[PDB]
Amino acid sequence: ASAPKYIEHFSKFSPSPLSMKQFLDFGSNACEKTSFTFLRQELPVRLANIMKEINLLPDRVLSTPSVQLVQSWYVQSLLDIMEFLDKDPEDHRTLSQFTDALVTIRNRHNDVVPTMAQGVLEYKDTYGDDPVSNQNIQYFLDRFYLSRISIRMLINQHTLIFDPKHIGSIDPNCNVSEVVKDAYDMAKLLCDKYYMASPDLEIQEINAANSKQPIHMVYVPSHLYHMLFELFKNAMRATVESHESSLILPPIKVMVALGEEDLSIKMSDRGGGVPLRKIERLFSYMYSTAPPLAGFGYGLPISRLYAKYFQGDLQLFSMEGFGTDAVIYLKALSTDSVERLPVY
Amino acid sequence: ASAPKYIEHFSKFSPSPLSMKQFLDFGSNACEKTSFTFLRQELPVRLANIMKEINLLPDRVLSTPSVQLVQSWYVQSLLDIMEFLDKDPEDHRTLSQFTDALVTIRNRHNDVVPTMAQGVLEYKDTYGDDPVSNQNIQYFLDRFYLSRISIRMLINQHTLIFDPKHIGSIDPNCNVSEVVKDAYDMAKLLCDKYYMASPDLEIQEINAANSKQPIHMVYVPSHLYHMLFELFKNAMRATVESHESSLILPPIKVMVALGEEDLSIKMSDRGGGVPLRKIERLFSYMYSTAPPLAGFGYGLPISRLYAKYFQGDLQLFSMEGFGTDAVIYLKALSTDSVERLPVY
Ligand SMILES: Cc1cnc(Cl)nc1-c1ccc(N(Cc2ccc(CNC(=O)C(F)(F)F)cc2)C(=O)c2ccc(O)cc2O)cc1
Ligand SMILES: Cc1cnc(Cl)nc1-c1ccc(N(Cc2ccc(CNC(=O)C(F)(F)F)cc2)C(=O)c2ccc(O)cc2O)cc1
Ligand SMILES: CC(C)c1ccc(COc2ccc(CC(=O)NCCN)cc2Cl)cc1
Ligand SMILES: CC(C)c1ccc(COc2ccc(CC(=O)NCCN)cc2Cl)cc1
Ligand SMILES: [Mg+2]
Ligand SMILES: [Mg+2]
Ligand SMILES: [Mg+2]
Ligand SMILES: [Mg+2]
């Protein structure tokens, strides 16, 4: 077969980050043929870039069953996409079987996270969990997961639009507060199920330039939901367990600020907090992988990748003895919301 | 002369970080001879370590008048200290002229900050202000200033004690709130002088393990004052200028938390804040050097060195459109308060 030639050829290209605008433009008025011709070039570049990095991992990592299985998904997905390079954009059955091919590729990779998690486990027990190992895992998974988010975003844009308010997974009129409430509601439901107390929510908005207006943005609200949900679940765990022997339960307080450049979402809790020393660990794939609410959500590392993905960030800071603020930093202006892709 | 042999010899040694305990022990019951024999070894190691680093700077930096002048102070101070190596600890005139020598050395170096500032200016205008330059300046000055804080601390411990509550510059019973109030009071005074409005203060304490108790610690309260004062001055500037056309002026809110491991001091303002993109810049010697309240205080970079100096930190996070939290993280337990010295 040809996977290594394909990988080599296509990793000579640089991925092409898209902006929100570019996304919205692909997504109306059936630009279908256009999405197609972009994607058949772009997905291989993206796939191959990460595949090259996978192949450069040391052999004692690369020969593990978990990496072998993922190496195998990428090869197959890259080949499935190949089939279409020389095919004819005007032929509607071409467009059709390409959408089928996208769905199948998306399915094939649904379980990477737990797959990678086993590889981390194997390596931790097999070579150790020293700081150097940790940085290398962190470095590799951040890139790899960031890479993964970007590909799933391309595929979802195409399959949702090519099967009027929403544009695939982008809401050009996202109501930030609405998403905060829904993710709160869902985390509370879980909370009340496993603890039979749950804190209230208090939302405050600060729309600097327009005192009055509800705060809206162009965003991928499924992403924003992932991040809010992870954050609520942690804050609820903290708050509830830290107040078992007490009567008053602090609310969880969220602030939504709209500046010239940032849209920031702070979520404050009084769960007793974490010492500065132990904070980075929460972001570590290595330390946050071991063999109640613990089962739910995308995790802090991935939540932060979602924020970084459109040039934002997710940060924590705590006051041990008191509680923790978690802030999601997003770009307020759609013209600043451009894909951030691992550097090659 | 012998400066380069001395530098080489003494940079073969590693500085010896001291803990609060070690500091308190030198500082009572006249351990004077002991402080003397420690210092005559330790100061040269410390001086020489930084001097070695100064000599490794590229020539286009090293040949500048500002660096030449500082290179010259260190040489002289290292030599003044040399005079004592073979001298006799039992002779009281020895002890005496050594204290004189310490005072003189401290004076000789009083003006490094503005000296270094001219070197940064020269280099910025002479070679540019690109990101690489910036990291190298940051790296060098952090180390150099951290080095400087540690030496001044040794000298001040000796000269204050060898000329009962306080122990030189260490207060084994520092009242954190007291220092917050005093630095607030001083920053307000300045504020009212240049603006004729100034925000109020609100202090809240959270003593996790002892709900009741005022929060106390073993610290160098002059340091804690430097950091609180810089932070108040910024928060007052922000708050006041951001509310000129408005009637209500938010207070500046400080929280003092005492955990198992951290003592944290958060100072919150509603000055409108800073976008995430521009935050690191506030810590940059390069960008925060250009040719009202602006004249006062030690600066953010040095304030953070003071916090790092005893294994703590100083961090900022803002919500553009709203305001800024600044948190000083200190070690709650004196057994964790050990000098952090630049690595060699
Ligand atoms: C990482 C994580 C994953 N899943 C779940 Cl359910 N929780 C966490 C989690 C949650 C809170 C924390 N802590 C530390 C913490 C841990 C446990 C507790 C509960 N208290 C106790 O267990 C105690 F035993 F002391 F009583 C409080 C705080 C925080 O301070 C915190 C961190 C992130 C965040 O977004 C929000 C936060 O509040 C750490 C881990
Ligand atoms: C670094 C510094 C040094 N000296 C002085 Cl007097 N001030 C500052 C300073 C202060 C505040 C900021 N800003 C940004 C800022 C700058 C200006 C203003 C005032 N508003 C305006 O000038 C406006 F023009 F928009 F109205 C508000 C915020 C902050 O958000 C902030 C930073 C650190 C800190 O500890 C506290 C802070 O509040 C930046 C620089
Ligand atoms: C399965 C995934 C999560 C995973 C598991 C484990 C790893 C571990 O990766 C390491 C560990 C140590 C070193 C230093 C070193 O030895 N360098 C020289 C090259 N051998 C390099 C790498 Cl790439 C990465 C990704
Ligand atoms: C005066 C103080 C504040 C000061 C002023 C200026 C500097 C600047 O230092 C630089 C700038 C660029 C580089 C890259 C490079 O050229 N590397 C190869 C070696 N030439 C290295 C260094 Cl050490 C430091 C400290
Ligand atoms: Mg598309
Ligand atoms: Mg963080
Ligand atoms: Mg001493
Ligand atoms: Mg910071």
Residue numbers in the entry:
A (entry chain A), B (entry chain A): 6 to 33, 35 to 169, 177 to 304, 314 to 366
Question: What did the study's authors say about this model?
Answer:
PDK, a member of the GHKL ATPase/kinase superfamily, regulates the activity of the pyruvate dehydrogenase complex (PDC). The PDC represents a central control point in cellular energy metabolism in that it links glycolysis with the TCA cycle by catalysing the oxidative decarboxylation of pyruvate to acetyl-CoA in the matrix of the mitochondria. The four mammalian isoforms of PDK (PDK-1,2,3 & 4) reduce PDC activity through phosphorylation of specific serine residues in the E1α subunit (pyruvate dehydrogenase). PDK isozymes have been shown to be over-expressed in clinical cancer specimens and this augmented expression has been correlated with poor prognosis as well as drug resistance.
